[PDB]
Structure formats: C-alpha cells, structure tokens
Amino acid sequence: GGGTDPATMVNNICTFILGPFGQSLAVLGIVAIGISWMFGRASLGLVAGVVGGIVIMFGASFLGKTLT
Amino acid sequence: GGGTDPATMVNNICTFILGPFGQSLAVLGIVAIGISWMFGRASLGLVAGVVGGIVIMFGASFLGKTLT
Amino acid sequence: GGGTDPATMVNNICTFILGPFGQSLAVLGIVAIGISWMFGRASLGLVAGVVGGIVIMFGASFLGKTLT
Amino acid sequence: GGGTDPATMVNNICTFILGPFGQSLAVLGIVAIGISWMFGRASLGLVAGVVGGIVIMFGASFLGKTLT
Amino acid sequence: GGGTDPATMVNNICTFILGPFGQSLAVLGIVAIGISWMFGRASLGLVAGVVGGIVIMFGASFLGKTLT
Amino acid sequence: GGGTDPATMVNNICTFILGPFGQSLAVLGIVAIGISWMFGRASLGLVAGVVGGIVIMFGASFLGKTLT
Amino acid sequence: GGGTDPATMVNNICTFILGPFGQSLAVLGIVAIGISWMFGRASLGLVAGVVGGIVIMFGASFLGKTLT
Amino acid sequence: GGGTDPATMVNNICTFILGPFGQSLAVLGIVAIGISWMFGRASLGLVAGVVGGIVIMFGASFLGKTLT
Amino acid sequence: GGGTDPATMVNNICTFILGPFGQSLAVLGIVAIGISWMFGRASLGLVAGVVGGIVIMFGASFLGKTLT
Amino acid sequence: GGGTDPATMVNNICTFILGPFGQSLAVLGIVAIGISWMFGRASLGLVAGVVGGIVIMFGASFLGKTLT
Amino acid sequence: GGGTDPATMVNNICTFILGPFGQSLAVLGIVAIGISWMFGRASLGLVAGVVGGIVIMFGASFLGKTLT
Amino acid sequence: GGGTDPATMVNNICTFILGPFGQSLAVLGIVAIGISWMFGRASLGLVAGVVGGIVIMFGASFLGKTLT
Amino acid sequence: GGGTDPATMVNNICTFILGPFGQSLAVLGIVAIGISWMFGRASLGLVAGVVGGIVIMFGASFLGKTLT
Amino acid sequence: GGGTDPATMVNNICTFILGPFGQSLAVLGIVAIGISWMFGRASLGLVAGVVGGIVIMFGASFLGKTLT
Amino acid sequence: GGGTDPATMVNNICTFILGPFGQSLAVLGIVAIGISWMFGRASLGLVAGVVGGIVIMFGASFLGKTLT
Ligand SMILES: CCCCCC/C=C\CCCCCCCC(=O)OC[C@H](COP(=O)(O)OC[C@H](O)CO)OC(=O)CCCCCCC/C=C\CCCCCCCC
Ligand SMILES: CCCCCC/C=C\CCCCCCCC(=O)OC[C@H](COP(=O)(O)OC[C@H](O)CO)OC(=O)CCCCCCC/C=C\CCCCCCCC
Ligand SMILES: CCCCCC/C=C\CCCCCCCC(=O)OC[C@H](COP(=O)(O)OC[C@H](O)CO)OC(=O)CCCCCCC/C=C\CCCCCCCC
Ligand SMILES: CCCCCC/C=C\CCCCCCCC(=O)OC[C@H](COP(=O)(O)OC[C@H](O)CO)OC(=O)CCCCCCC/C=C\CCCCCCCC
Ligand SMILES: CCCCCC/C=C\CCCCCCCC(=O)OC[C@H](COP(=O)(O)OC[C@H](O)CO)OC(=O)CCCCCCC/C=C\CCCCCCCC
Ligand SMILES: CCCCCC/C=C\CCCCCCCC(=O)OC[C@H](COP(=O)(O)OC[C@H](O)CO)OC(=O)CCCCCCC/C=C\CCCCCCCC
Ligand SMILES: CCCCCC/C=C\CCCCCCCC(=O)OC[C@H](COP(=O)(O)OC[C@H](O)CO)OC(=O)CCCCCCC/C=C\CCCCCCCC
Ligand SMILES: CCCCCC/C=C\CCCCCCCC(=O)OC[C@H](COP(=O)(O)OC[C@H](O)CO)OC(=O)CCCCCCC/C=C\CCCCCCCC
C-alpha cells in the first residue's frame, strides 16, 4: 500500500530532533538557564544539568553506538 | 499451505527489535533523557532508568539464556 | 490545514525572548540586583549571578552554536 | 447518495483544529499556564509542557510528513 | 437548532478571562505575593513567578500570535 | 437560580482582604517583625521584606492597573 | 398525565444547588480549607482551588451564558 | 417517610464543626504549633498557617456570605 | 452501640496533652535547649523558640478562647 | 420462619464495630501511626488523619444523629 | 467449625506488636536514628520523631483508652 | 515449611548491626568527622553529632529497655 | 483416582515459598534495595519496607498461628 | 518438557547481579557519586548512601542468611 | 538477533565516562571551582569537594575493586 520501514521512521525522528529543531531547542535551554540565574540565584548544579542535557540529547546517536 | 515455525516468528521479532530498529530506539531514548534534563531538572534516577532499560532490552537474549 | 514548521515556532520563541521583551527583562534584572544591594547588603556573588544570567540568556544562540 | 471522501473528512478535521479554533485554543493554553504560575509556583517544566504541546499540535501536519 | 461556532465559544473564554475577571484575578495575585512576603520571608523568585504569570496570562493572545 | 457574577466574587475577595481584615493583618505583620527584632537580632532585610509585603499587598489593585 | 418540562426540572436543579443549599456548601468548603491549613501546612494552591471552585460553581449560570 | 431538608443537614454540619467540636479542634491546633516550635525550630510561617487556618475555618459562614 | 461524643474525644486529647504527659514533654524541651547550648553555641533565638513553644502549647485552650 | 428485623441487624453491626472490636482496632491504629513515625519521618498530617479517623468512626452514631 | 473471636484476633495483633517483637523494633528504631546522626547531620527533629513514634506505638492501648 | 520467628529476625538485625559491622561503621564515622575537620573547619557541633550518633546507635538495646 | 488433600497442597505451597526459593527471593530483595540506594537516594522508609516484607513473608506460619 | 527449577532461576539472577555485571555497576555508582560531588557540592550523606547501597547489594546473600 | 552482553554495555559506560569525555569533564570541574573562587570568596571546602569528586570519579574502578 503506502507503508515504509519502521526503522526509517524512527531514524526520521532522530534526524528531526537533532536537526534545526534541536538547535532551536538548545537555544531555548540556554535561555531558560539564563533566566533561572537572572530572577533566582545562580548555582553550578542547574547549569550543569541544562548543559549536560544538551550534550546528552545531541550525543544520543554516538552514546547509543557506544552502548552498542 | 503457507505456514512457518512459530519459533521462527518469535525469533524474527527478537531479531527485528534488536536490529537497526532497536539502535534507532536507543538513540531516541537518549534523546528523551537529554530533553528531560534539559527542560526539567537533572536527576541520577532518570538516567539510570533509561540507560538500564536500554541495557535490559538489548541484553534480552543473554538475560534469557542466564535464566535458562 | 493551518499548521507551520515546529522549527519556526521554536525559533519564534527564541526571537521573542531575545527581542524587546528580553531587553525589558534585562532592565528588571538590574533593578532587582540594585534593590537587593539597597535594602540588604552588597555582595559580589549576587551581581555576578544576575549579570551572568543576562549574558547567558542573550548569548543562548551563540552559546548553542558553540555547543553545536 | 450524499457521501464524500473519508480522506476529505479527516482532512477537514485537520483543517478545523489548526484554523481559528486552534488559535483560540493556543490562547487558552497560555492563559492556563499563566494562572498556574500565578496561583501556584512557577516551574520550567510546566511552561515547557504547555508550549511544547502547542508546537506539537500545530506542527502535526509537518511532523506527520517527516514521519512519512 | 441553537448551536454556535466552537471558535466563538473558545474566543468567549479568552474574552472573559482577559476581561474584568482577569483584572480582579491580577489584583488577588498581587495580594497573595504580598502576604507571602508578609508572613513569610521575602524572595525575588516568588515575585518573579507571580508577576511573570500575570504577564504570561494577559499576553496569551499575543504570545499565541507570535507562536503562529 | 441564585448565581452571581464571577467578577463580582473575585472583586469581593479583593474588597475583603483590603478592608478592615487587611488592616488587622498589617498590624500583626508589624507585630511579627517587632518580635523578630526583639528575641532575635535586628536586620534591615527582614523589616524591608515585611514592610514591602504590606505595600505590595495593599497596592495590589493599583499595581495590577499599572500592569494593565 | 403528570409530566412537566424537562427544561424546568434542569432549571430546578440549577435553582436548588445555587440556593441556600449552595450557601451551606460554600461554608463547608471554607471549613475544609481551614482545616487543611490547620492540621497540615498552608499553601496558596489549595485555597485557590477551593475558592475558585466556589466562584465557578455559583457563577455557572453566568459562565454558561458567556459560553452561549 | 423520614426525610429532611438537605439544606438542613449541610447546615447541621456547619453547626457541628463550628460548635464545641471546633473549639476543641482549635485548642489541638494551637497544641500542634506549640510542639512544632518545641521539638523543632520556631518559624513565623508555621504559626501563620495554623492561626490562619483557624481564622478561615471559623469564619467560613461569614467568608461565604462575603463571596455571596 | 459503643460510641461517644466526638467533642469529648477531642477534649480528651486536649486533656491528655496538657496533663502529666505535657509536663514531661516540657521537661524534655528544656533538656533539648540545654544540650543545644551545651554542645553547640548559645543563642537567644533558640531559647525563645523552645520556651515560646511551651507557652503556646500549654496556653492552647486559652489562646483558642481568645480567638473565639 | 427464622427471620429478624433488618434494622436490628444493622444495629448489631453498629454495636459490634463500636464494641471491644473497635477498641482493639483503635489500638492498632495508634500502633500503625507510631510505626509510620518510627521507620519514616514524623508529620502532623498523618497523626491527624489516624486520630481523626478514630474520632469519626466511634462518633458515627452521634454524627449520624446530628445529620438526622 | 474452627473459628474464633474477631476481637481476640485483633487483640492478638495488639499483643504481638507490643511484645518482644516491638522491643526488637524499638531497638532498630534507635539504631536507625543513631546512624542518621552518624552519617548525616544531627537534628532534634529527627530524634523527636523516632522517639515519639516509639512512645506512641507502645502507648497505643492507653492512648486508645483515653480516646475511649 | 521453612519459617522462623519474626522476633528472631528483628533480633538478628539488632545483632548484626551491633556486631563487627557496627564496629567498622563506628570507625568510618570517626574517619568522616576527622576529614570534615581536616578539609573544612573544626566545630564542636559536628563531633558532638557524630559521637552522639555512635553512642545512640550502639546503646539502642539499652535505650529501648529504658523506654520499656 | 489420583487426588490428594487440598490442605496438603496449600501446605506444599507454604513449604516451597519458605524453602530455598524464598531464600533466593530474600537475596534478590536485598539486591533490589541496594540498587535503589545505589542509583537513587538512600531512605530509611524503603529499607524498612523491604526488610519488613522479608520478615513478614518468612514469618507467615508463625504470624498465622498468632492470629489463630 | 524444557523446564527447570524455579529456585535455580532465582539463584541465577542472584549469580548474575553479583557477578561481573555487579562489579561494573559498582564502578558506575562510584562514577555517579564522583560527578555529584564534582558539579554539585560535596556531602557525607550522598557518599554514605551510594557506598551503603553497594555494600547492601553485594552483601545480599549474607544479609539474607543472617535474616534466615 | 542483535543483542550483546549487559556486562559489556555497563563496561562500555565505564569506559566512556573515564575516557576523553571524563578528561574534558575534569577540565570543566576545575574551571567551575576557579570561577567560584573568582566571583565569590575562596574556601578550602569547595576545592576539596571538586577535587575529591574528580579523584572519586576516575578512581571508581579501583575503588570498586577494593570494595570487592
Ligand atoms: C556553551 C557554554 C554553555 C555554558 C555557559 C557558560 C558561560 C558562562 C558561565 C559563567 C558566567 C557567569 C560567571 C559568574 C557566575 C558567578 O560567579 O555567580 C556567583 C554565584 C553566587 O550565587 P550565591 O550567592 O547563591 O552562592 C552560590 C555559590 O555557592 C557561591 O558562589 O555563585 C555561583 O553560583 C557558583 C558559580 C557557578 C559558575 C558556573 C560556571 C559554569 C561554566 C561551565 C560549566 C560546564 C557545565 C558542564 C555540564 C556537563 C557537560 C557534560
Ligand atoms: C536475568 C535477569 C533478569 C532481570 C534483569 C536484571 C538486570 C539489571 C537490573 C538493573 C539494571 C538497572 C540498574 C539501575 C536502575 C535504576 O536505578 O533506576 C532508577 C529508578 C528511578 O526511577 P523513578 O524516578 O521513577 O523512582 C522510582 C524509585 O522509587 C526511585 O529509584 O529507580 C527505580 O526504578 C528502582 C530501582 C529498580 C531496580 C531493579 C533491579 C532488579 C534486579 C533484579 C530483580 C529480581 C526480580 C525477581 C523476580 C521474582 C523472581 C521469583
Ligand atoms: C515526528 C516527531 C513526532 C514526535 C514529536 C517530537 C517533537 C517535539 C518533542 C519535544 C517538544 C517539547 C520539549 C519540552 C517538553 C518538556 O520538557 O516538558 C516538561 C515536562 C514537565 O511535566 P511534569 O511536571 O508533569 O513532569 C514530568 C517529568 O517527569 C518531568 O519533566 O516533562 C516531561 O513531560 C518529560 C519530557 C518529555 C520529552 C518528550 C520528547 C519526545 C521526543 C521524541 C520521542 C520519540 C518517541 C519514540 C516512539 C517510539 C517509536 C518506535
Ligand atoms: C506592578 C509591579 C508588580 C511587582 C511589584 C514591585 C513593587 C515593589 C517591589 C519591591 C518592594 C520591596 C523593596 C524591598 C524588598 C527587600 O529588600 O526585602 C529584603 C529581603 C530580605 O529577605 P531575606 O532575609 O530572607 O534574604 C533574601 C535575600 O537573599 C537577601 O536580601 O531580600 C529579598 O527578598 C531580595 C529583594 C527582592 C526585591 C524584589 C523587587 C522586585 C521588583 C520587580 C520584579 C520584576 C519581576 C519581573 C517578572 C517577570 C516579568 C516577565
Ligand atoms: C472570602 C475569602 C475566601 C478566601 C479566604 C481569604 C482569607 C484569609 C487568607 C489569608 C489568612 C492567612 C494569612 C497568613 C497565611 C500564611 O502566611 O501562611 C504561611 C505559609 C507558610 O507555610 P509553609 O511553611 O509550608 O511555606 C509555604 C510558602 O511557600 C511559604 O510561605 O505560607 C503560605 O502558605 C503562603 C501564603 C498563602 C496566602 C494565601 C492568601 C489567600 C487570599 C486570597 C486568595 C484568593 C484566591 C483566588 C481564587 C481564584 C478566584 C477566581
Ligand atoms: C466560561 C468559562 C468556563 C471556564 C471557567 C473559567 C473561570 C475561572 C477559571 C480559574 C478560576 C480559579 C483560578 C485559580 C485556580 C488555581 O490556581 O488552583 C490551584 C491549583 C492547586 O491544586 P493542586 O495542589 O492539586 O496542584 C495542581 C497543579 O499542578 C498546581 O497548581 O492548581 C491547579 O489546579 C492548576 C490551575 C488550573 C487553572 C484552570 C484555569 C482554566 C481557565 C480556562 C480553561 C479553558 C478550558 C478550555 C476547554 C477547551 C475548549 C475547546
Ligand atoms: C491567639 C494567638 C495565637 C497565636 C499565638 C501568639 C502567642 C505568642 C507568639 C510569640 C511567642 C514566642 C515569642 C518569641 C518567639 C521567637 O522569637 O523565636 C525565635 C526564633 C528563632 O528561631 P531560628 O533560629 O530558627 O530563626 C528564625 C528567624 O528567622 C530568626 O528569629 O525566631 C523566629 O522563629 C521568628 C519569630 C516568630 C514570631 C511569631 C509571633 C507570632 C504572633 C502572632 C502571629 C499572627 C498570625 C496571623 C495569622 C494570620 C491571621 C489572618
Ligand atoms: C490519644 C492521643 C492520640 C494522639 C497521640 C498524641 C501523643 C503524642 C503526640 C506527640 C509526641 C511526639 C512529640 C514530638 C514530635 C516531633 O516534634 O517530631 C519532630 C518532627 C520532625 O520531623 P521532620 O524533619 O520531617 O519535619 C517535619 C516538620 O515540618 C518539622 O518539625 O516534626 C513534626 O513532625 C511536626 C510535629 C508533629 C506534632 C504532632 C502532635 C500531635 C498531637 C495531637 C494531635 C491532635 C490530632 C487531632 C486529630 C483530629 C481530631 C478531630
């Protein structure tokens, strides 16, 4: 009919999230951490969490390859 | 007629989930944990759950063999 | 129907927060740090946190680009 | 008799939800998140969920196209 | 029979919440933050959350338009 | 039946909190700050928080009008 | 026989719930929120929910008229 | 048969909770706040919550009348 | 069956806590404040909190009567 | 035959639950709250719930009479 | 057949929990509070909760008798 | 089947924690307090907490006996 | 035919669960609590639940005898 | 058919978790505590929880034997 | 299918965190402690925590081996 590879679809999701959409998300994540420092009180834990989340999320393909 | 081994079919499901489809799923799992840290607050429990789920899911054949 | 790019929407959020709205937020952040010194006791840590938050929040696009 | 394309009807639902009705829903979603911050306590997770839901819901056509 | 536009109804909800009812809610929000400072201890985070919630809730139409 | 304007009710809450009940609350707030200085150690931050909370809470209508 | 307007009956339910019975319910709602603060810990969210529920429930006729 | 006014029953609940039973509850609430200061550390927020809960709970009839 | 007044039970709790059990608790509270000064550093705030808690807890009946 | 009053049977259930069986249940309820404080962390809400449940359960006859 | 008093069974549970089993539990509760001070930081609240839980749990019969 | 006394098991836990395992824990507790003084700043409160925790934890049987 | 005592079968289940199979289950329960502390955050409640479950499960015969 | 001892399977799980897989888990637990100190602030409680979890998890067989 | 050893995967995580990724993390940890001294006030406790975290995190394999 009009089907496609399930592997292709999940790969499309990986492609979309790690494309320009992910770059815009990364910008908003840095915006959020900036505001949290701004109208709250600065902390090393919060910047570590946000930056670490960005590193983990964009490294998902390579982190998955290392996990095999 | 046109039948096949039920054991072969269940083995095909094991083959498919642990093939490229599982690798793409593993990438999306790391994407999800990255975003959860990103727009939430980082926690060791959540990364342990996601990474442990990936380890369990790809180790299913070997974990099953150990269970005999 | 009436949809649009998800990437465009997240880019619109980046545009809005870093536009005149962010400038007004930056003013209020400097207001808050001024009052904290004013009716409290001055400290280098608090001004560093507020100013650093402003630098991080407006530098989000460029900080994200450096993170790639 | 008086039938029509099932594809047209489902496309009409996509058109209606993403039209002015969706814009009004988007306004009420931002109203709800504003009140939740207002009479509760502000959190980055809740604004991320509401804004992300709006992005996902209006991006449904394009997200579906990427999924093919 | 006696129906009406669903878009009109959702627009009526937007009109009602952002009308005099929202102004009275905004007053009570400032009352709540005043009492929290009053019988608790003052903090910049709590006033930022309450004021930000008011800004978000009344800006819902314009924030939604920017999200398109 | 026996309903009334929701706007009237929220306005009644604004009227009640800012009436004689608020004046009595304001007295107790000054009592609390006096005792905190009394059996603790005097500080400018605590009096600023309590007095600022009273100013914010009674100025809620006018602060809300300025926020429009 | 001995029938009546279904519209009258539903209007009677609206009349009864919004009459003295609703006033007594409103008193018990304020009793419940008082006890929750009393033998628990005070929170702005819980008073907002209870008071908002009272406002919504007595404003049902007018809220319904606005929805048309 | 042996029925009675539902309004009377809800009024009976209001009468019972605000009678001698409520006075005994008020005593236990002051006992609880005293012990919390006693074997913990004193705070203005906790006494405000307990005392405010007592004021709200006994003022339920009058608070409800003001809400109309 | 074998029931009793709920008011009597709550009054029994008031009687028990304010009886010899409360006197023994008062002794342990003074023990705790003595040790805190002993193996820590003396402060007027801590003795005020403990002594104030004892005064509040034993004065609960009379404090409740004043609140009416 | 060998029937009896349904009212007598329901009254027998009221008699049994409020007799020595209820006293033993009351002891176990205080045991449960003691252990919850013991191997958990003490809270005023939990003791209020357990003690309030005992007061409500033994006051059922009198609470029902007040409800008429 | 082989039944027994439900009151006896609930009394047996009261007997068992308050017997040597409860004494051993009391020892472990003091062990837990000792370790919490040991590998954490000492606090009066935690010892009050654990000791109070032991007092409440072993006093359940007498506390229940006072509640009648 | 293969059961045993619940009292014996809880007594076994008391035996194990207060045996050589507790002695090794006591050594590590003194190690921790030594390092806290070492790479921090010495304080009488911290040594009192750690030593008091050891005294409480090993005295659990005798402290429980005194509580009866 | 080939039947047996229903009492024997239920006793066989009691024998099997409390035999070597229960010992292996007890080991896995301690494994689970160790990992929960390990990749989460330690808490006294969770160890109390797991250890208490083991005590209850192996004490089932004796706990049942006490219940008669 | 192709069955095996349920006791053997649960023993296999005990063998697997306490084998090389557990050693690798122990390494990751020490990694996690190191990072928590690293990008957060050092605390004795967190290292006690992680190390205690490792001790409990690998001691599960012997801890279970002591519980009998 | 496409599975692998769960032990290998957990060992891969140990390999990845302790490889070049850990070296880069170690650099950022020293960066963070430098900035904390820089825009705050120097303290021996904070450098001890950060350096100790690095020592613990890279020593995880050897610390785990010592724990056996
Ligand atoms: C593309 C870069 C994205 C990061 C933006 C960096 C730019 C720029 C980052 C730094 C820009 C601001 C510099 C001044 C900030 C400051 O000094 O603020 C004073 C506040 C005072 O607050 P308070 O009174 O409450 O006391 C809290 C403290 O106890 C006492 O000080 O102290 C702090 O908060 C701690 C300092 C945090 C430093 C974070 C650096 C992170 C860099 C890098 C971190 C690397 C994260 C690694 C993540 C893991 C990756 C696997
Ligand atoms: C051949 C082995 C098959 C099993 C695979 C084991 C491999 C490997 C199993 C473990 C591999 C992952 C280790 C890290 C997992 C983790 O730490 O995740 C954090 C999440 C955080 O989530 P959240 O925020 O929602 O809070 C939920 C909790 O309250 C707070 O933590 O915590 C948990 O979920 C609890 C931990 C469950 C541990 C299960 C071990 C089962 C082993 C053995 C179980 C034996 C089962 C016995 C069955 C009965 C037999 C008769
Ligand atoms: C074509 C793409 C279609 C998917 C749309 C993705 C676009 C875009 C997807 C992401 C766009 C929104 C980003 C921000 C969302 C957010 O951060 O919200 C905060 C809320 C806060 O709520 P709360 O307080 O209740 O706490 C709940 C949590 O415990 C604490 O956070 O946290 C969450 O809900 C968890 C985050 C879910 C992330 C889902 C990503 C799925 C992507 C991909 C998933 C792949 C699915 C694979 C399916 C299987 C396939 C075989
Ligand atoms: C229509 C205006 C509505 C706001 C009312 C402003 C009027 C008036 C606002 C200010 C009126 C009071 C001035 C004095 C308050 C004070 O100095 O209190 C001392 C307390 C002492 O407490 P403690 O001992 O616990 O130590 C806590 C601190 O660490 C040490 O000080 O310090 C503080 O709390 C921090 C100061 C907060 C300042 C908030 C200003 C917000 C303005 C504007 C904020 C803009 C919010 C933007 C939201 C986002 C929008 C997108
Ligand atoms: C007829 C009026 C009915 C309401 C009764 C008002 C009377 C009277 C209402 C106020 C009477 C009590 C005043 C003192 C209460 C107090 O200060 O308590 C300290 C506790 C401390 O607890 P903790 O340690 O856990 O920390 C929790 C906080 O983070 C730190 O403080 O702080 C609070 O709980 C927050 C304060 C809530 C204020 C609610 C006002 C609602 C009014 C009006 C609300 C308007 C609701 C609008 C609903 C929506 C309508 C569309
Ligand atoms: C004619 C208007 C009819 C609606 C009545 C609105 C009037 C008035 C509506 C608002 C009047 C009450 C305002 C204060 C309510 C409040 O703040 O309560 C605190 C409780 C605290 O509870 P808790 O502790 O359990 O934590 C739960 C939350 O996680 C933490 O907060 O928080 C909430 O519940 C979330 C807030 C819900 C806001 C709903 C607004 C809906 C409006 C509009 C919705 C639009 C619906 C669109 C439907 C789809 C249409 C296609
Ligand atoms: C019938 C009266 C019932 C109240 C009992 C009053 C009797 C008597 C009330 C007062 C009797 C005790 C007086 C001395 C208490 C004391 O000084 O303790 C020192 C502790 C030290 O602790 P720490 O080291 O942790 O530092 C915490 C602080 O930051 C530093 O000090 O400081 C405090 O806790 C703050 C002081 C709270 C004062 C509360 C008064 C409430 C009155 C009235 C409140 C009105 C409540 C209004 C509710 C809303 C109504 C709508
Ligand atoms: C026959 C009497 C039955 C009750 C047993 C009373 C005996 C005796 C009752 C008291 C015996 C113990 C006294 C010391 C307990 C303690 O101080 O513990 C410290 C813990 C510390 O924990 P954490 O660190 O987590 O911080 C939690 C708090 O925020 C900070 O403290 O603080 C608490 O838990 C709050 C104190 C609760 C007090 C409950 C009294 C109830 C009495 C009476 C209640 C009346 C109930 C009315 C019910 C409704 C009736 C209609």
Ligand SMILES: CCCCCC/C=C\CCCCCCCC(=O)OC[C@H](COP(=O)(O)OC[C@H](O)CO)OC(=O)CCCCCCC/C=C\CCCCCCCC
């Ligand atoms: C003849 C009277 C019959 C009623 C018995 C009242 C006697 C007496 C009723 C009250 C006697 C007990 C007083 C103390 C109870 C308590 O404070 O418990 C703490 C628990 C803690 O639990 P947790 O940790 O899980 O957190 C759950 C909450 O989120 C945090 O607190 O909090 C609660 O449960 C909420 C309080 C419920 C109050 C119900 C009052 C109903 C009265 C009246 C209700 C009117 C009902 C109207 C029905 C509709 C009629 C049309």
Ligand SMILES: CCCCCC/C=C\CCCCCCCC(=O)OC[C@H](COP(=O)(O)OC[C@H](O)CO)OC(=O)CCCCCCC/C=C\CCCCCCCC
């Ligand atoms: C059979 C007895 C069982 C109890 C064991 C007592 C033996 C022995 C109990 C005492 C043995 C140790 C004595 C030295 C402890 C110490 O001084 O530690 C310093 C730490 C420093 O920590 P940090 O820096 O974090 O600052 C925290 C403080 O703010 C500053 O100090 O200060 C404390 O923690 C407060 C002191 C608590 C005292 C508790 C006594 C309870 C007795 C009796 C309590 C009675 C409980 C009543 C319960 C309710 C009953 C209804």
Ligand SMILES: CCCCCC/C=C\CCCCCCCC(=O)OC[C@H](COP(=O)(O)OC[C@H](O)CO)OC(=O)CCCCCCC/C=C\CCCCCCCC
């Ligand atoms: C022959 C005796 C049979 C019973 C075995 C008792 C032996 C022994 C029974 C007790 C043995 C274990 C003691 C320690 C258990 C524990 O403390 O666990 C911590 C968990 C933590 O879990 P979490 O994080 O999810 O938070 C859940 C809670 O909110 C926070 O704590 O807390 C609990 O679960 C509540 C405690 C339940 C206590 C049940 C006692 C029942 C006795 C007697 C009950 C009587 C029953 C009456 C029935 C009605 C009769 C008419």
Ligand SMILES: CCCCCC/C=C\CCCCCCCC(=O)OC[C@H](COP(=O)(O)OC[C@H](O)CO)OC(=O)CCCCCCC/C=C\CCCCCCCC
């Ligand atoms: C194979 C060994 C695994 C452990 C690694 C040990 C190696 C190495 C462990 C030690 C390596 C680092 C040494 C310097 C650390 C330091 O001094 O940091 C300063 C920070 C400053 O932070 P802040 O400003 O926030 O103030 C927090 C404090 O209040 C003030 O200081 O102080 C601390 O955090 C307390 C010190 C914790 C010491 C933990 C030792 C655990 C050992 C052994 C613990 C035994 C655990 C037993 C578990 C139970 C077993 C049944």
